[PDB]
Amino acid sequence: KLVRLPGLIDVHVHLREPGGTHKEDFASGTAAALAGGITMVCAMPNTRPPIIDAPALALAQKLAEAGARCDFALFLGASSENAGTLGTVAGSAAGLKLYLNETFSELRLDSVVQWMEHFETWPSHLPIVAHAEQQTVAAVLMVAQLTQRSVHICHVARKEEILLIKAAKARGLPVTCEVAPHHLFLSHDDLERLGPGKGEVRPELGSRQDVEALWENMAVIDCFASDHAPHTLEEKCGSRPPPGFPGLETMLPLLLTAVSEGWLSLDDLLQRLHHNPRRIFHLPPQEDTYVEVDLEHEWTIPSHMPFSKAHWTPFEGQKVKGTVRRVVLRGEVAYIDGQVLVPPGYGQDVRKWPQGAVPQLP
Amino acid sequence: KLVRLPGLIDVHVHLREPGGTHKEDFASGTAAALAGGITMVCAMPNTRPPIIDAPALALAQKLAEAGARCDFALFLGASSENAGTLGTVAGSAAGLKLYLNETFSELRLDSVVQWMEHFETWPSHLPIVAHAEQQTVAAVLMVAQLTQRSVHICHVARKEEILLIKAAKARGLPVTCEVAPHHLFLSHDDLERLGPGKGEVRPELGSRQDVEALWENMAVIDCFASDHAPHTLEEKCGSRPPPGFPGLETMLPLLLTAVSEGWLSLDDLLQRLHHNPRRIFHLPPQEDTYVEVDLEHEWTIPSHMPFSKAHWTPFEGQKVKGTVRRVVLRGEVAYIDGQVLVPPGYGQDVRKWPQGAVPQLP
Numbered sequence: 001k002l003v004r005l006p007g008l009i010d011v012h013v014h015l016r017e018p019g020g021t022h023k024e025d026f027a028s029g030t031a032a033a034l035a036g037g038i039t040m041v042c043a044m045p046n047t048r049p050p051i052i053d054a055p056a057l058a059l060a061q062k063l064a065e066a067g068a069r070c071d072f073a074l075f076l077g078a079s080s081e082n083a084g085t086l087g088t089v090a091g092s093a094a095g096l097k098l099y100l101n102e103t104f105s106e107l108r109l110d111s112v113v114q115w116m117e118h119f120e121t122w123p124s125h126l127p128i129v130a131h132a133e134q135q136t137v138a139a140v141l142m143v144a145q146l147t148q149r150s151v152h153i154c155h156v157a158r159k160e161e162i163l164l165i166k167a168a169k170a171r172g173l174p175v176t177c178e179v180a181p182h183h184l185f186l187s188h189d190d191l192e193r194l195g196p197g198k199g200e201v202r203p204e205l206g207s208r209q210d211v212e213a214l215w216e217n218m219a220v221i222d223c224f225a226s227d228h229a230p231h232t233l234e235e236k237c238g239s240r241p242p243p244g245f246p247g248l249e250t251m252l253p254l255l256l257t258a259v260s261e262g263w264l265s266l267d268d269l270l271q272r273l274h275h276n277p278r279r280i281f282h283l284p285p286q287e288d289t290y291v292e293v294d295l296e297h298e299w300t301i302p303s304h305m306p307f308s309k310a311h312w313t314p315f316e317g318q319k320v321k322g323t324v325r326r327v328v329l330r331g332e333v334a335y336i337d338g339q340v341l342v343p344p345g346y347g348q349d350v351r352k353w354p355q356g357a358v359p360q361l362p
Numbered sequence: 363k364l365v366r367l368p369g370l371i372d373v374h375v376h377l378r379e380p381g382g383t384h385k386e387d388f389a390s391g392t393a394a395a396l397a398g399g400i401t402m403v404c405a406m407p408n409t410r411p412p413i414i415d416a417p418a419l420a421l422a423q424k425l426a427e428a429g430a431r432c433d434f435a436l437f438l439g440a441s442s443e444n445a446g447t448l449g450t451v452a453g454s455a456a457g458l459k460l461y462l463n464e465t466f467s468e469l470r471l472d473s474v475v476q477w478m479e480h481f482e483t484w485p486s487h488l489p490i491v492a493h494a495e496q497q498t499v500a501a502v503l504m505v506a507q508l509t510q511r512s513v514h515i516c517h518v519a520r521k522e523e524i525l526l527i528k529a530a531k532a533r534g535l536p537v538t539c540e541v542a543p544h545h546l547f548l549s550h551d552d553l554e555r556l557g558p559g560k561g562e563v564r565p566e567l568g569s570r571q572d573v574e575a576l577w578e579n580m581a582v583i584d585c586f587a588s589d590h591a592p593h594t595l596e597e598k599c600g601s602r603p604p605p606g607f608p609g610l611e612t613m614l615p616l617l618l619t620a621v622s623e624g625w626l627s628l629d630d631l632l633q634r635l636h637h638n639p640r641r642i643f644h645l646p647p648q649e650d651t652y653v654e655v656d657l658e659h660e661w662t663i664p665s666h667m668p669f670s671k672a673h674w675t676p677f678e679g680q681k682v683k684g685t686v687r688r689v690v691l692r693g694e695v696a697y698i699d700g701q702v703l704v705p706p707g708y709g710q711d712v713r714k715w716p717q718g719a720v721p722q723l724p
């Protein structure tokens with residue numbers, strides 16, 4: 001007896017194309033998405049070249065249209081030079097991403113004044129999302145209030161962060177947030193097993209108190225999103241390991257396991273992987289699209305999942321319950337029991353659909 | 363220059379069929395919906411016969427399929443006799459409606475124990491909505507906690523109510539709510555003009571402080587819903603006036619006027635008339651469905667709107683800015699500039715669509 005779910009949406013993935021295609025490309029990353037029950041992804045802009053101008057966005061659009069197997073939207077990235085220059089292409093993007101801390105990116109903003117300039121110039125009806133850790137969450141919330149608009153906080157990982165966001169929501173401030181599976185299912189207790197290279201990620205893994213605070217404050221979490229951040233094992237275990245975990249293929253099984261344990265309901269899961277991503281990012285429905293899962297199947301995560309070119313996973317050895325059996329995307333079987341059945345290029349840019357534009361005042 | 367909106371959803375309407383068809387029927391009420399930019403309605407169960415058993419639901423389903431011009435879902439109503447008896451038809455309904463105070467209904471529950479029995483027996487994954495005023499909001503929230511599930515509060519009208527719900531949300535409790543336009547745009551100050559018959563409504567009109575508290579706490583309001591409650595003028599001005607206002611044709615123009623005044627954003631409006639109704643009630647998308655509005659057109663609400671058989675309105679004389687120009691429903695023009703162009707029976711029961719069933723654990 002399978003359970004039918006709507007097409008799930010991951011609003012935070014790194015697909016590495018252009019420029020990092022040994023780690024992942026659109027074809028392999030969207031295969032990973034479909035195998036994880038994800039039919040729409042929003043791809044981050046920290047590629048090479050980074051997606052920080054109209055020519056880079058145009059390149060990325062064609063690469064994604066040619067390689068993606070599921071539907072997608074592409075983020076633009078804020079830089080120290082492009083505030084006030086993105087107005088003609090802003091509506092074609094998922095949103096604007098701000099990198100406000102040190103991580104796998106060159107998109108460094110050196111001054112809060114640059115954050116203000118982006119909040120002032122980016123169209124006010126379009127999404128802004130931020131990599132903002134610890135006190136940076138409070139700082140970017142202040143910039144959002146000064147400019148009288150909303151902000152979405154990426155991968156919240158700490159008790160400090162979720163309680164700050166909780167207090168802001170209690171005051172009626174327009175802030176939403178997402179949490180990634182590794183900050184719900186891994187902690188400091190796992191760093192001995194992982195080692196210092198594999199264990200590198202931003203935000204770093206939290207304490208058991210951080211993990212418990214996120215679960216206790218589930219009502220504050222608007223979205224789950226993988227922050228699928230693939231790097232090869234050689235890179236993770238070399239002299240200067242880049243931060244990040246692959247996660248598209250393990251997100252839904254981990255969360256289904258939590259549903260089976262009673263840690264959250266199926267509705268809680270569908271709000272955070274379908275309805276709230278749609279409404280925060282104004283992402284369109286996908287016609288004739290659904291995911292069939294087997295909630296009874298018990299298995300152990302192996303040393304690598306089938307599709308991501310990362311070819312490793314920090315969840316190796318975890319016992320899970322629940323698996324994706326079949327995905328249908330816009331009327332075509334896209335995935336069955338380990339086989340992807342739509343080719344590279346089947347996926348489309350949802351911001352080009354009439355129903356996928358963000359409504360705005362004239 | 364028209365603005366394209368998604369198909370809007372009203373989760374609280376009274377269409378009066380069966381049994382009150384001089385007030386409204388499915389054909390006239392859904393014409394009123396389309397003229398108000400509403401493409402999906404959830405119809406309340408306080409008809410004659412009331413929708414409190416499988417035979418009554420079957421009758422109402424066929425009447426709606428034959429008469430509705432937009433898509434719909436039908437609520438079941440809780441009674442003093444039907445707890446534990448609705449399990450086989452529960453999934454086919456919009457949800458379960460509880461009448462917990464005196465209003466235009468015979469569906470009186472005399473004891474909180476009957477509320478508990480409904481919360482215990484109604485399937486836990488399906489919506490429950492309540493007419494619950496003043497302290498009854500706190501009481502039904504307590505029943506929801508004792509039974510460990512969510513509840514949706516209909517037509518919140520008072521400072522007392524919205525602050526109670528705000529405090530519950532701050533504690534992480536699963537409660538959502540809706541507000542009707544008359545509790546945002548009318549107050550005690552209007553009772554002299556309306557008179558004591560026309561002015562009868564439940565919840566009654568609030569003070570200026572109540573209205574101001576709802577606007578100040580917009581962040582707490584999940585949905586707008588009309589509580590379209592048509593009665594004829596003869597009935598409203600006779601010896602025993604029934605409570606309620608018609609509202610489908612005036613809701614969106616009033617709210618568009620508020621957007622033009624800066625009282626809330628277009629996004630705020632679309633969360634509350636589209637995305638949050640979808641996610642609270644698990645209502646499906648409508649393919650090739652959208653609403654075109656003219657935000658510039660200034661007009662004054664007349665003594666009756668064109669379609670509702672109520673043939674009166676409490677908003678007569680209000681100056682509004684914004685109007686519905688065109689509605690397309692599932693690929694067909696449904697309304698243009700005052701003309702409805704889909705016949706009775708064009709509308710469908712969204713709970714019969716594969717994408718319209720509420721997901722549940724096996």
Ligand SMILES: NC(=O)N[C@@H](CC(=O)O)C(=O)O
Nearest residue numbers: 014103104201202229243244
């Ligand atoms: N999270 C990470 O550790 N790495 C991400 C970047 C990000 O989300 O900061 C990546 O692109 O590798």
Ligand SMILES: NC(=O)N[C@@H](CC(=O)O)C(=O)O
Nearest residue numbers: 376465466563564591605606
């Ligand atoms: N609100 C009203 O004043 N009347 C509604 C019932 C309701 O929503 O209580 C009706 O059905 O007439």
Ligand SMILES: [Zn+2]
Nearest residue numbers: 103131154202
């Ligand atoms: Zn990040």
Ligand SMILES: [Zn+2]
Nearest residue numbers: 012129154155
């Ligand atoms: Zn993010």
Ligand SMILES: [Zn+2]
Nearest residue numbers: 012044227229
């Ligand atoms: Zn990231």
Ligand SMILES: [Zn+2]
Nearest residue numbers: 465493516564
């Ligand atoms: Zn009511």
Ligand SMILES: [Zn+2]
Nearest residue numbers: 374491516517
């Ligand atoms: Zn209601």
Ligand SMILES: [Zn+2]
Nearest residue numbers: 374406589591
């Ligand atoms: Zn009502």
